[PDB]
Enzyme design. Structure first.
Site, mmCIF file in Angstrom:
data_model
loop_
_atom_site.group_PDB
_atom_site.id
_atom_site.type_symbol
_atom_site.label_atom_id
_atom_site.label_comp_id
_atom_site.label_asym_id
_atom_site.label_seq_id
_atom_site.Cartn_x
_atom_site.Cartn_y
_atom_site.Cartn_z
ATOM 1 N N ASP A 18 0.834 -1.193 0.000
ATOM 2 C CA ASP A 18 0.000 0.000 0.000
ATOM 3 C C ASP A 18 0.872 1.247 0.000
ATOM 4 O O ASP A 18 1.738 1.411 0.864
ATOM 5 C CB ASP A 18 -0.923 0.000 1.215
ATOM 6 C CG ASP A 18 -1.738 1.272 1.326
ATOM 7 O OD1 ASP A 18 -2.497 1.576 0.381
ATOM 8 O OD2 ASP A 18 -1.622 1.964 2.358
ATOM 9 N N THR A 58 0.575 5.905 -4.976
ATOM 10 C CA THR A 58 1.891 5.679 -5.558
ATOM 11 C C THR A 58 2.058 6.430 -6.871
ATOM 12 O O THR A 58 3.174 6.837 -7.212
ATOM 13 C CB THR A 58 2.111 4.182 -5.770
ATOM 14 O OG1 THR A 58 1.745 3.467 -4.584
ATOM 15 C CG2 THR A 58 3.562 3.885 -6.124
HETATM 16 N N1 LIG Z 1 -6.530 -4.942 -12.922
HETATM 17 C C1 LIG Z 1 -5.646 -4.031 -13.392
HETATM 18 N N2 LIG Z 1 -5.190 -4.088 -14.662
HETATM 19 C C2 LIG Z 1 -4.313 -3.189 -15.148
HETATM 20 N N3 LIG Z 1 -3.824 -2.172 -14.416
HETATM 21 C C3 LIG Z 1 -4.197 -1.992 -13.128
HETATM 22 C C4 LIG Z 1 -5.151 -2.934 -12.531
HETATM 23 N N4 LIG Z 1 -5.346 -2.532 -11.263
HETATM 24 C C5 LIG Z 1 -4.582 -1.428 -11.058
HETATM 25 N N5 LIG Z 1 -3.899 -1.108 -12.174
HETATM 26 C C6 LIG Z 1 -2.962 0.034 -12.322
HETATM 27 O O1 LIG Z 1 -2.096 0.097 -11.187
HETATM 28 C C7 LIG Z 1 -1.911 1.449 -10.767
HETATM 29 C C8 LIG Z 1 -1.939 1.527 -9.247
HETATM 30 O O2 LIG Z 1 -3.182 1.038 -8.754
HETATM 31 P P1 LIG Z 1 -3.456 0.947 -7.172
HETATM 32 O O3 LIG Z 1 -2.623 -0.168 -6.587
HETATM 33 O O4 LIG Z 1 -4.950 0.955 -6.958
HETATM 34 O O5 LIG Z 1 -2.874 2.343 -6.621
HETATM 35 P P2 LIG Z 1 -1.520 2.393 -5.749
HETATM 36 O O6 LIG Z 1 -0.524 1.579 -6.538
HETATM 37 O O7 LIG Z 1 -1.198 3.865 -5.672
HETATM 38 O O8 LIG Z 1 -1.921 1.774 -4.432
HETATM 39 C C9 LIG Z 1 -3.004 2.282 -11.416
HETATM 40 O O9 LIG Z 1 -2.433 3.416 -12.078
HETATM 41 C C10 LIG Z 1 -3.699 1.362 -12.401
HETATM 42 O O10 LIG Z 1 -3.643 1.888 -13.731
#
Ligand SMILES: Nc1ncnc2c1ncn2[C@@H]1O[C@H](COP(=O)(O)OP(=O)(O)O)[C@@H](O)[C@H]1O
Ligand SMILES: Nc1ncnc2c1ncn2[C@@H]1O[C@H](COP(=O)(O)OP(=O)(O)O)[C@@H](O)[C@H]1O
Lengths: 520, 77, 519
Positions: free
Chosen positions: A54, A88
């Site tokens: 996270d 992130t």
């Molecule tokens: N199922 C998925 N398929 C493709 N890309 C994804 C998917 N889920 C998240 N992402 C990509 O991963 C990035 C980070 O998502 P997330 O983990 O929700 O935020 P963080 O990494 O800030 O915690 C986003 O920019 C998104 O485009």
């Protein structure tokens, strides 16, 4: 005073030193981006050990003593309340913009001029996102696709085992506290709690207030229909204090009098429940077995051993009033509720107090159960993404396709519009395009693929193959075009993501002196 | 940017301004050192043949490709 | 064995003056990049690790506290300029170090320090005379209302900012907030509060004191939100049930005694609650939280209650209402109780905001900002505070001169052309005084990312042909008539900057030796 050992460094050597610190915070988090992100092993000051990816939790535990890095953490503190998902993405994009800015400082650009260039490109990007956006629940209140999209993002966290049951719960909560017509949801009213035991599927939505407390007797009514909720500090029996008893009898003349106050007050106090008409008697300290006898014949429900702050939580939801002394008892101070029930979680005798209003109230809470404390906490933040996701979905139906499709489309628009910028910000606008590509380039790297070959191939498909935006297949599904894969992020999310990132870059670029007096 | 530097101009704003004049105009826009600023080079009668610019990219790129292909050097005797 | 100093460190002559000249430039470098609205910020860390980010020159010098002797002279001079005016500390600090830098090579060539002092005292008086002769009074120019011209000066500072598209609304909020005050105007009186989210145009301007009102305890459907002439009570008492300030704890065996303990526990809080009721307070408020039990007492007795108010907002209402913040509830009476004309609870952005309008001592107000993030409001917060000062300055002093270094280049032309007619050693020094004025329009170009060469050469050439108000434009990389652009500054405030600058440089130039008692 204390001019000795004072920090003194300015110019490009200071800006590059500040940029060096922000890159370390970005590169540390660039690998934890996406569902294929690499976890981070955090060791607490108390000696605990935790592992997660996270972005928000990484920054909270990352105690970087550098001042420029602290501002990067303060930025993310606000992002969790606006975007929720791409914490992130903000830090990774800020590190990319600062890394590309270092190439401009060698060319002789001023930091304030780069700050103006990124602000111009950030407006071009924010303008382009609305063009490539799409609606979901336009001109109709629907619950089916709202459960579908939120369910996709949750599948990456530890809620994947029961991800479907969580999405339906996050919909009824926001739908209860807030109306889809007004489109003004209040995330403060949506609380979160949990307890070890059971499984993730046992998570529930309480339309009202919940406190982990049981009836005064198992023979009490399992469902209280009457709306007469008397809240007190002392129980309806021979009174005792709220802090400590410390029983130390003196002699028998005193003890036999205590027996008299039992029969005198057990009937008199419970008769007050009938004189005023109370049905559900909530109280700080619990009842003895004697009062349970009188309560059972007349069907008088009552809670026992309620905590200090737990009392106030029920009065705010039910709209009642605390009666700290029996002399202050009356009908007006009684709470109100449609139906109060006791949820016995199967073989586990939890017996949680569930005071419900039998309608969509202005207060909800999602109690997350689980057989492991580490999975519950990571599941608590997983649900937190769904709330801000559903909050932005209702506040704005417009959404854009994730997977890096938006960042690649924005980079093409910024690159074309950069030619129409006859000033030194032209070099900065081009740098904003290359910096936008680091988010998709990071997802490809974390997935175990060639980043640059996957980056340019998707971009060429956004021009040569077809004009609509296409993302990166990070989960190794069938192909690109995340619209088919149903991976879509909120438009408010991306707008604030690159806006907060630019604002942090301008705030860092406009700092060229960190002065701190040393100890002599 | 090297011509602009030698002419006393800003190396960045000169090429940054010309990249907009070329997007809107044509190749006539270039640095004029005789006047000390950007001007329409077609009117100044400051031109060069095509073989100079073509042979420069041709021979320079072949040298860069040749230097890029050098994995290592061996000392013989 | 027998020496004269024995710890007494002392040096005299030219090396001491040159040492002080270089030490003064260090203070200039600390505030060189902060000159202007778009100046770079400065990060300062105290001993506890707390950070401080600010682009104000006066606030930077207060936190440094440099121990060098010569540097303290500029800091105390700049601090006095902040107390008397609150603006111009950076101009005074830069000009002083620049007067010292230009005469540095002449001091090394054997020129006496006292001859340099006669040049600054002479060139200063000639400059002050040139300001008053060229200055212009603007009160009713073009038959335009003062509310409109002050709008132009307000948006000038707000131009090409994060609120540039909606600065017409924000420009009126500055003129409105300043016009609400009485003859005695001050920047501290007009407060500002930040509210995340919402459109930029939704920024509200409350005539009285306003605060977030995080008080969300019970008490709804009672406590009327409107009062004609309420007796406002300001306290710091915690009337919570589960309170650490008001509670009881006795432990015995006799259950009959617990009947008195639990009841006496509330009787103590009732004697404190009844003292508020008997005092006649209608709109009661306190800094500490207030519990649900207490709010029921205010409801049963038809009384208003709103706790969790910041002390700054309470003290801001103290000077507005004219009461007194009494800690204990025992001394609450008419002596401390405030008053107001119209009170109402609004719904700014969904949350409730209490505010007393038309107070007896209503010399203050509040401006609630709205935006998509904190940096939209924080960047907007910095520019509006100077916008209030600009409007506050134009009404006070009607005589003004062109800002952006325009007046500094005009004096450089007058003093330089005057120095030629002055035979003697004053020629090179009055000319050196003139070149030192170039730093003000120079750093505005360097801090704005512009080419100081192309602007200063194009700017100095315009003044020779007849220009008198042309100066530096921080927005567009070119020269502009700062007078026609309504970039003004008070002439008397600029006069006090040159005087404090020369008087500060004269104190350093007149010094030749430093003495230090060994301690
Ligand atoms: N199922 C998925 N398929 C493709 N890309 C994804 C998917 N889920 C998240 N992402 C990509 O991963 C990035 C980070 O998502 P997330 O983990 O929700 O935020 P963080 O990494 O800030 O915690 C986003 O920019 C998104 O485009
Ligand atoms: N909108 C503007 N355009 C051009 N110059 C400006 C503008 N606003 C302020 N300045 C210039 O910035 C300088 C510093 O202003 P200020 O910050 O108020 O004083 P200080 O820097 O001493 O605190 C002034 O000399 C003024 O000429």
């Amino acid at each position: 005073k204390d001019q000795d050992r004072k920090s003194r460094l300015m110019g490009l050597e200071a800006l590059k030193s500040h940029i060096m610190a922000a890159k370390a915070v970005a590169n540390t988090m660039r690998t934890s981006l996406g569902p294929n992100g690499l976890d981070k092993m955090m060791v607490d000051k108390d000696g605990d050990v935790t592992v997660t990816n996270d972005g928000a939790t990484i920054l909270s535990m990352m105690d970087v003593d550098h001042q420029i890095a602290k501002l990067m953490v303060e930025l993310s503190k606000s992002q969790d309340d606006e975007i929720g998902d791409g914490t992130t993405g903000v830090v990774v994009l800020a590190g990319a913009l600062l890394e590309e800015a270092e190439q401009l400082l060698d060319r002789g650009i001023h930091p304030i001029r780069i700050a103006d260039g990124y602000e111009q490109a950030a407006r071009v990007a924010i303008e382009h996102l609305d063009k490539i956006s799409d609606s979901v629940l336009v001109d109709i209140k629907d619950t089916e696709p709202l459960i579908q999209t939120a369910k996709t993002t949750l599948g990456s966290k530890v809620v994947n085992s029961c991800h479907r049951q969580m999405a339906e719960i996050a919909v009824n909560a926001v739908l209860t506290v807030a109306d889809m017509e007004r489109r003004d949801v209040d995330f403060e009213l949506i609380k979160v709690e949990g307890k070890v035991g059971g499984r993730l599927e046992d998570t529930k939505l309480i339309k009202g207030v919940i406190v982990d407390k049981d009836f005064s007797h198992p023979q009490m009514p399992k469902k209280v229909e009457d709306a007469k909720i008397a809240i007190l500090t002392c129980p309806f029996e021979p009174p005792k204090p709220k802090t400590k008893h410390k029983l130390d009898v003196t002699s028998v003349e005193d003890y036999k009098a205590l027996q008299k106050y039992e029969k005198e007050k057990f009937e008199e106090m419970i008769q007050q429940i009938k004189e005023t008409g109370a049905n559900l008697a909530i109280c700080q300290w619990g009842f003895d077995d004697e009062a349970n006898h009188l309560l059972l014949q007349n069907n008088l429900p009552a809670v026992r051993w309620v905590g200090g702050p737990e009392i106030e939580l029920i009065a705010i939801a039910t709209g009642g009033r605390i009666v700290p002394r029996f002399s202050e008892l009356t009908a007006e101070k009684l709470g109100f509720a449609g139906l109060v029930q006791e949820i016995s979680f199967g073989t586990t005798k939890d017996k949680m107090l569930v005071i419900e209003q039998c309608k969509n109230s202005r207060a909800v809470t999602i109690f997350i159960r689980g057989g492991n404390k580490m999975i519950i906490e990571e599941a608590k933040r997983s649900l937190h993404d769904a709330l801000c996701v559903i909050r932005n979905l209702i506040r704005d139906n417009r959404v854009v396709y994730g997977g890096g499709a938006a960042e690649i489309s924005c980079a093409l628009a910024v690159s074309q519009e950069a030619d129409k910028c006859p000033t030194l910000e032209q070099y900065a606008m081009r740098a904003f395009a290359d910096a936008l590509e680091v988010i998709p380039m990071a997802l490809s790297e974390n997935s175990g693929m060639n980043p640059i070959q996957t980056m340019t191939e998707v971009r060429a498909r956004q021009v040569k193959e077809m004009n609509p935006a296409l993302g990166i297949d990070c989960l190794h599904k069938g192909t690109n075009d995340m619209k088919q894969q149903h991976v879509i992020e909120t438009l408010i999310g991306k707008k604030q993501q690159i806006s907060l990132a630019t604002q942090m870059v301008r705030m860092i670029l406009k700092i060229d002196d960190i002065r701190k007096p040393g100890e002599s | 940017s090297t011509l602009a530097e030698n002419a006393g101009l800003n190396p960045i704003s000169t090429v940054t301004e010309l990249r907009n004049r070329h997007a809107q105009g044509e190749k006539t826009a270039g640095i004029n050192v005789r006047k000390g600023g950007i001007s329409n080079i077609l009117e100044e009668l400051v031109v060069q043949p095509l073989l100079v610019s073509v042979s420069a990219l041709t021979l320079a790129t072949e040298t860069v490709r040749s230097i890029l292909k050098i994995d290592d050097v061996v000392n013989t005797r | 064995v027998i020496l004269l100093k024995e710890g007494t460190d002392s040096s005299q002559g030219i090396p001491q003056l040159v040492s002080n000249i270089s030490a003064c430039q260090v203070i200039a470098e600390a505030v060189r990049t902060t000159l202007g609205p778009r100046g770079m910020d400065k990060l300062i860390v105290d001993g506890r690790g707390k950070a401080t980010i600010s682009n104000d020159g006066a606030t930077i010098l207060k936190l440094l506290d440099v121990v060098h002797p010569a540097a303290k002279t500029l800091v105390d001079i700049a601090k006095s300029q902040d107390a008397e005016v609150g603006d111009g500390t950076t101009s005074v600090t830069l000009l002083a170090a620049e007067f010292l830098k230009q005469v540095k090579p002449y001091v090394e060539e054997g020129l006496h320090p006292q001859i340099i002092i006669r040049a600054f005292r002479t060139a200063t008086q000639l400059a002050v005379n040139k300001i008053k002769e060229i200055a212009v009074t603007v009160k009713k120019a073009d038959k335009v209302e003062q509310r409109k011209l002050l709008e132009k000066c307000a948006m000038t500072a707000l131009s090409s900012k994060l609120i540039s598209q909606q600065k017409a609304f924000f420009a009126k909020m500055v003129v409105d907030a300043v016009m609400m005050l009485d003859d005695l105007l001050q920047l501290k009186m007009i407060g500002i509060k930040k509210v995340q989210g919402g459109a930029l145009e939704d920024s509200q301007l409350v005539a009285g004191v306003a605060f977030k009102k995080t008080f969300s305890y019970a008490g709804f459907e009672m406590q009327p939100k409107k009062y004609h002439n309420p007796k406002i009570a300001l306290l710091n008492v915690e009337l919570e049930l589960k309170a650490e300030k008001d509670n009881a704890e006795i432990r015995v065996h006799t259950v009959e005694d617990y009947q008195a303990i639990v009841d006496a526990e509330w009787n103590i809080l009732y004697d404190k609650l009844e003292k508020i009721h008997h005092s006649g307070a209608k709109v009661v408020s306190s800094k500490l939280p207030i519990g649900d039990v207490a709010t029921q007492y205010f409801a049963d007795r038809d009384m208003f209650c709103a706790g969790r108010v910041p002390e700054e907002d309470l003290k801001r209402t103290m000077m507005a209402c004219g009461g007194s913040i009494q800690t204990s509830v025992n001394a609450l009476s008419a002596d401390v109780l405030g008053r107001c004309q119209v009170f109402e609870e609004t719904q700014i952005g969904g949350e409730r905001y209490n505010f007393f309008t038309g107070c007896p001592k209503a010399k203050t107000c509040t401006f609630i900002l709205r935006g998509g993030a904190e940096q939209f409001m924080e960047e907007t917060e910095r520019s509006l505070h100077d916008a209030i000062m600009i409007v506050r300055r134009a009404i006070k002093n009607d005589s003004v001169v062109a800002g952006g270094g325009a007046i500094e280049m005009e004096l450089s032309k007058y003093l330089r052309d005057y120095s030629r007619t002055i035979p003697g050693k004053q020629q090179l020094l009055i000319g050196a005084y003139a070149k030192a004025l170039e730093i003000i329009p120079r750093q505005l170009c360097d801090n704005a990312g512009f080419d100081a060469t192309n602007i200063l050469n194009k700017l100095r050439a315009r003044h020779a042909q007849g220009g008198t108000w042309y100066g530096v434009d921080i927005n567009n990389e070119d020269i502009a008539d700062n007078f026609e652009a309504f970039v003004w500054e008070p002439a008397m405030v600029r006069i006090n900057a040159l005087t404090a600058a020369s008087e500060a440089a004269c104190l350093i130039v007149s010094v030749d030796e430093t003495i230090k008692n060994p301690r």
